[PDB]
């Protein structure tokens, strides 16, 4: 219903992936014996989009991700008109989670953002495992086209009901369980820049490489599905 | 159904909450090499959850958490009439529960609840990784507020039937996945007023903060679903 | 349908709950450096109820635990006539996955079903903490009845349908995440016979203890369920 | 509906199943302390079949493997004459992952298919545990079968409808928990094909039983389905 619902659902639920996903790597992932690794970051990202697609996937969508937007838009199943909106929405519910993450995590002796990274998407000399840009590409490329297609799949017309939420937040585990050591796992250009803008540095750097193969990656995933898969 | 029902099922729910969640962190997460982590008890507090809201949440609702409770109220989800009721049954069934535990936990040679702090909440000297009272309450807050706003919009009536419980539970997993090394994550005053009691010291005069910041989390969470984003 | 399919189902069943929960065990926990702990092998017991409740429930009920089925016929649930024929049927398909179990075992060298326990539950000396007997009987009485009221609700004419092996398979994992320290979790008698006679020595000393408390505990379970929460 | 939507779902669903399993395995599974074991490899296998069965399944039925498919034969549920073309489909999207799985895996200094295995299946000498060929077979077979029991079962007309891609892609996760120690885990020609490709040595020269062990286990599996189960 009226868009101020849609964007507010939208705002939250971006805001729930990164306080979310992302304060699991800042705060839980590395704690001395008891962390949670990539493992856990993983389960808690898809568990966010879980958690909203199921609260508020019924007044929006539940796209939570500028990649899933537009690879909608270009799936046909969603309409240009709402979707620079959506964008905004996104990005400006993920930069206030960053920035109350930022808070409670600079309430440790020693946290520093830069320095660590904050949870920040890199490639080359800032991915995680030493990967190469390529590495890079390729990665987010098939994972978010492979993203769109779940999304695209399991909310079709003709899928079981009521259970996309399952799929695609699962789907967003599985992603980064493959990827974390790659490039932290993007997949989303809202939750790079959210976290980009605290790292202050190189993540604002290569924060470019994050909008362009995301969505680049969901709008193939798209047309994969609406011209290979879907009628 | 009648009121001894409900009563009985917000209890049973809080009582496996307290055992499950918090035996899993005093038996099973620091374990020598075999251990379940931050990971495993954040598993199994969800668990808890999900499994009692499908077993009894036809019967009470499933709240299992007086800031549940309280902020169903708030979101014009609950009668001010039952509130008291499900408070008081929530900490007694939890206490029970902690008893229980704390008679299993003294049957290993060691066992010192004071000294290890009996999975209880703490902020500033006992954070687990050593946080400012603000990290706490800020974390606190958001995490009580999100769970709130997945509570109300996984059981709006237009959400899906039936997939609530794996909402719900699954975020309870999540705000544990992110919040354990910040307050050992309470988002529950039934749940910590359960193990300060057997803790003695230090729980029990920081448990204030876990009956007011749950519980207006718990509040705003409500607020801003009935105001900004249910009709 | 006619009986033959119902106890097909639960040796089936029963089969693989123990190949699957005691092979992780056995086979994967330990692991050096990549192994999947007393976490991995919670999931993995209740993956195996969680697919073949969905597998076989539809035939049988899904049972796959004398426990489970003398609790079921407490609650008045299910009738005293099909109670012994599903017992046999769960204790034979536990037993024939415990030999194939330790033929696959047993092709790895230094394989010693006797001195590594080959999963066996235990109290006492036989406890992987060290948990005296008493420890041991709280907690599987606990969650043995705490297994069975989950079971009963889920089960319920009113809960939701179709998603009783979700609740019930979790519940599994739940149940294991808090007390494979205390008595490498039994709340199944068919699973505890099983491997007992594999590791032929306390293992069947203690099995009694195994038989007693998680049926006792079923009983329990249902008439909590019955008496208390059900009408 | 045409058979064009149907293979070029089969292709894709293993695709992202050969992609994302043994990527995790290949990129993420050992990485320095913060990897994800066995148990995220089990758990990123099993969420490719529940994501894809949830997006593609309504198209092909969601097999992704030769095993299923062949053993899906075998149970009277699908029909000889797409056989071949499946099988083909699964190959050859399976291919086209480890190929652009290796791409992404060269792009960090040290990579070595032939001597890291390249999360090839196995068994002796190339058995991860170090278990006999005997071992492989046992466990292969068992879970192969058990695996096509549980997808015959929860797609039987009298199972809970919309489920079974949850029920599926969870017994693969548990199949991963129970085996990777013995043979990395098959129970899939076309995932072992794939990935011995590019190992190029050992890999292809065993390659020939993870066709024949997963696919008789399948059709047994499949036979004791519709023999003692289904009517
Ligand atoms: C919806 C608003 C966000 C738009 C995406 C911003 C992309 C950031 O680009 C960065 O800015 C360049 C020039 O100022 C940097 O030098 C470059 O490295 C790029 O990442
Ligand atoms: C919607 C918010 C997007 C903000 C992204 C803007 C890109 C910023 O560019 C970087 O800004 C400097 C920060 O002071 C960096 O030091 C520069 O290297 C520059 O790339
Ligand atoms: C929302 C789209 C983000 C802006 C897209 C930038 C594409 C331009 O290509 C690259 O951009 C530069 C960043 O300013 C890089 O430094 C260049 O190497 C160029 O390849
Ligand atoms: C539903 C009954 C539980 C009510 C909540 C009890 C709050 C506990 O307050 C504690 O008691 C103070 C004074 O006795 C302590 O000194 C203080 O630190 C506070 O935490
Ligand atoms: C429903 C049960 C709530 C019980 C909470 C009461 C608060 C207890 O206050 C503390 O009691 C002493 C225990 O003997 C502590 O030593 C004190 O510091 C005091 O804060
Ligand atoms: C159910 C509500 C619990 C009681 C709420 C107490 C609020 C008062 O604020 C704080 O309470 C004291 C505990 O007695 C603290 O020690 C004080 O610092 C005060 O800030
Ligand atoms: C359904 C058949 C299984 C029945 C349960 C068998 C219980 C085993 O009892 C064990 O046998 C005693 C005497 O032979 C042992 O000494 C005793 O320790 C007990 O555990
Ligand atoms: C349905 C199978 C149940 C089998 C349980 C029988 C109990 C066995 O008793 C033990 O048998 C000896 C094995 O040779 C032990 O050494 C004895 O200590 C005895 O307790
Ligand atoms: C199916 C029920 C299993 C048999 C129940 C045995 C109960 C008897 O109590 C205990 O049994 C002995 C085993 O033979 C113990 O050794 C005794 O200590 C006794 O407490
Ligand atoms: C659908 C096409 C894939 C068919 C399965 C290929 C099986 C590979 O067999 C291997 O080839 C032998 C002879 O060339 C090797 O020496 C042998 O070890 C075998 O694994
Ligand atoms: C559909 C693709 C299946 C490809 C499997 C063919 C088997 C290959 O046999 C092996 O080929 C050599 C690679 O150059 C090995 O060195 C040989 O040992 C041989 O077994
Ligand atoms: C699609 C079926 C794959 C081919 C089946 C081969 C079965 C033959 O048995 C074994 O095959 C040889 C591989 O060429 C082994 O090396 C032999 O030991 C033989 O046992």
Known sequence: ???????????????????????????????????????????????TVLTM?????????????????????????????????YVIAQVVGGIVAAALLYLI??????????????????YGEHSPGGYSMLSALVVELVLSAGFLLV???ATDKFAPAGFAPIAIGLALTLIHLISIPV??????????????????????EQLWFFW?????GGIIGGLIYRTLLEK
């Open 1 to 47: 219903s009226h868009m101020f619902r849609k964007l507010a659902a939208e705002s939250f639920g971006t805001f729930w992936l990164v306080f979310g996903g992302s304060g699991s790597a800042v705060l839980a992932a590395g704690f001395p014996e008891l962390g949670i690794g990539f493992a856990g970051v993983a389960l808690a990202f898809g568990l």
């Open 53 to 85: 697609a199921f609260a508020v996937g019924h007044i929006s969508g539940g796209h939570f991700n500028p990649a899933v937007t537009i690879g909608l838009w270009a799936g046909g199943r969603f309409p240009a008109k709402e979707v620079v909106g």
């Open 105 to 122: 995590a600079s309430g440790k002796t020693g946290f520093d953002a830069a320095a660590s990274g904050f949870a920040s998407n890199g």
């Open 151 to 153: 999304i695209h799949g």
């Open 183 to 204: 490039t932290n796992c993007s997949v989303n250009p809202a939750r790079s820049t959210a976290v980009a803008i605290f790292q202050g540095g190189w993540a604002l």
């Open 212 to 216: 362009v193969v995301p969505i680049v």
